[PDB]
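Quick one - inputs below.
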Amino acid sequence: DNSNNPVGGNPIDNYGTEHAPLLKEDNQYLVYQGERIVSFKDLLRRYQYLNSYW
Amino acid sequence: DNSNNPVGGNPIDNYGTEHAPLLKEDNQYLVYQGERIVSFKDLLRRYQYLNSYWPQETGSGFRYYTLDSPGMPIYRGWDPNGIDQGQDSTAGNSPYNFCSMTLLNYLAPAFVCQRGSLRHKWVTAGARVNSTASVLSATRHGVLFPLPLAETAHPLDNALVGDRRSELQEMQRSRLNGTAITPVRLNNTLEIELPYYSIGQRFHASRFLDLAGTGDTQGVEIACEISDGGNDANYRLDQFVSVGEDFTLGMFVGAPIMYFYNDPTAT
Amino acid sequence: TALAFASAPFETWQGSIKFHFKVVCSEYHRGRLRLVYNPLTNNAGPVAFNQVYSTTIDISNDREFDYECKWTDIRAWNACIGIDGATSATFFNTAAAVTGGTPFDNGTLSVYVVNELATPSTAAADVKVQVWVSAGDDFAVAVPGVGLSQLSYFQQQ
Amino acid sequence: PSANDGPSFTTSKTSQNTTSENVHFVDGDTPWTYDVAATPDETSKLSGFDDAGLGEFLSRPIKIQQYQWTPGVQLFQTFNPWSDYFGNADVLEKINRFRNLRCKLCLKVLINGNSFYYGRALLSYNPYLRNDQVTVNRSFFIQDLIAASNKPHILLDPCSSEGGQMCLPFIWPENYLDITSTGWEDQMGECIIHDFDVLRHANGGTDPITVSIFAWAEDVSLLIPTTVAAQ
Amino acid sequence: PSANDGPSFTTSKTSQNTTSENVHFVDGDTPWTYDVAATPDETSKLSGFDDAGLGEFLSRPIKIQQYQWTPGVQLFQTFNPWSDYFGNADVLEKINRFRNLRCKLCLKVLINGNSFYYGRALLSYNPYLRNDQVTVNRSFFIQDLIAASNKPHILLDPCSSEGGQMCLPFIWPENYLDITSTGWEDQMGECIIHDFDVLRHANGGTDPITVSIFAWAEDVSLLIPTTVAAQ
Amino acid sequence: EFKHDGLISKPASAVAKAADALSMIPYIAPYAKATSMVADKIGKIARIFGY
Amino acid sequence: EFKHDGLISKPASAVAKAADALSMIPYIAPYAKATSMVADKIGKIARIFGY
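Output:
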């Protein structure tokens, strides 16, 4: 009865009426950040200084 | 009967037959000016010289000059936290900024709120020695701790290569934050733009005058190599400030108290 | 945690955090736990059933259960401490209540006893509870920062 | 509207009669009004947190009683749920500048138990008890369980470890009993837990088990404001 | 339903999941329920008294300030309406075990006057004032009325003896400012009454007149409960 | 918006005879940006207000 | 794919109101590259996942 699940999962009544309300705010990144970062494969394509050589 | 209106308004017969006649002159700016200026948001996108910075004033030897500056330009007059020192009216000394009064510095303390990206240019004029291949770099700071305007030198001419690498790793250029680099011998101009990242903040205090002693959350570190030989004493960096495209100001609550005076003698 | 791994290169976070509680006991160990959410901090004694958010799970039918702490903060984005900064602060106390209400977290989640542990014999019973942790559906991160500039995969020497 | 105001603000003249939640203003003339025209947007208020509000504060459960059965010892307990719920410190700040109450106080009993514990207890409720010279409240007699089994009761055992919820109606000869007066909730019905014999255990375990009693008011009608501190 | 119960009461088995205003009960088994089947009738509750309730408590006006003009003396006063409304003793019991507030504090100015009194005063509102190193708050200068006449303002006179109501929007960089933290309402905008010259009277009367300032919160969003005492 | 050679297609500074609507107020839609917005949603001459 | 001025035609960073499909998983076809693939085969907003 979902009692030794290796990933867990048995939702008990928590303190919200609305489930996951921050996904319903479409224009959230027009107010705070300007952009959204969803994947690391997008962020891995910024160059970063590694090391210097004389 | 419109008798305590906070904005006033009760038009009594004045000396004109035609009401507002200068709006009916369509081809007026074909005769006199050539252009019309309607908004400040159009005029805030002209760059204006703020301040200059001399890298051979902080360290010694061959080193890496770094300058932590706010994203918003610092203000023009007698600060209590100014980066320079002028002779005041009591024939003494007081902190003073020898920077210009930009249109952004003029318009911002008359509004409550402020939000938007801000654009900079770093021009690198002056003299220089013939043995330079330096890279001018701009890199942004975090949005939790605003760093004040400060100047630091990192020495690069040690005997150990590891103790040079440990100085290049004390720099914000080595970090995952946004970095723009350029060679001074080939382009010598950055043209960066600081975005408005924030810890859940919708705006910040537009009436905050103490940017040189506190900084803001859009600070940037500017970095450039310098040597201790002569003719680099005239090597400097010029900052041109302007306003990005998502920029806005809040509600107008009146002009601040202003002060009119020339620059004092710098001591 | 993979939740702490995937949020170290960033400087702001928001969203819901999922906590999976897992009671290891026999079939004859009975009682009620109680899960307080408090945005600031819990007082030094008993916590009342009003004035906090609580659930009071019976562990007869649900020995394993997860609880999703949604976003109830005065901001939209909190700050990220980083793995570098989380090593010096107390985030799991099990002797007193931790200090939330900072600009870095979304409050505190605490476990209290409602009904005592019932035992089938006179033997000493050492019951444990496991806390597993994951990101909820709301979870987002932003502002790439300097959170991992001081980390390393080589020991201190 | 008109007269020298811009898009950012508005100057108007409102009505002479201003009502806002029990204070009326009958003004001699229409006042002036300066609106700063501030409409916020969505994603500026938390949605889904309308469950625990201020108006439905008295529907929040509090743990009014907690007891522990030990094997070998009985539960004979006596409590007043109306004097335990409305004697709380936090609800007494919310019923503070009101006078009339009229609730219905539903309670709940939780017992954890085990398959080896056995025995049974009776929780009964005496409804009114104002001029009640009968229905004794004394020490334990086994013959007090016959009169108490006709009152509203619940049977609580540790073996199945189940059950327990009563509704406890308002019953009172007046409507809207006062909150200012002294002992205003004491004589409105009380609960007694009798035990039939004694808690036992089958493997000789001696651990206590817990009986918890929660209570909350269901359909509150709290409506006349006053300046007197509500006891 | 069935099983040996009469018309007066009901024994049932309710659900395993019990929710009542921020407390959830996940029970291991279905408990038993004894209902006494008590439905009251109409003419047992007062009707028409839903105006001053508990949920809309913060919309109740309180008199935050009272001043008196005398002929010959000016009004230069400075107050913080957010620190006067939410520093009250009775509202601080209602915002007590909550954390997030987000109000909009509309205020109202009443002046009684007479046809022989004259003079005029300006009441202005400074909206945010957190890192505000400008907009001085000092002694009286007549040149502080030029900067204060661009802020949200109202003009109050005794002759017509009229006017005065502003809305005072929320403006704040975060949504839902904390109630627990120290000085949580102090730096959110303040009002100053400047006087243009001096109160005068035309028959040489020297009686003072009263300027009263009321305030109340309009659209309250008070929603996250906590155990910490709200300052 | 971000388009190739956008300065050529503006009236960009000046008279532009139908650009004597300087007495009009710009309306900003409830989540409008500055770039791919009101400069095309108000009219042709909404670039003298800075958009 | 390899196209001339491809950054102009992206929504490229941000809100892009219909780009609130961040809760969708990207599907990769059995021999799909990153360039001339799923950025055009999933939808318009598959460029916030890095494709």
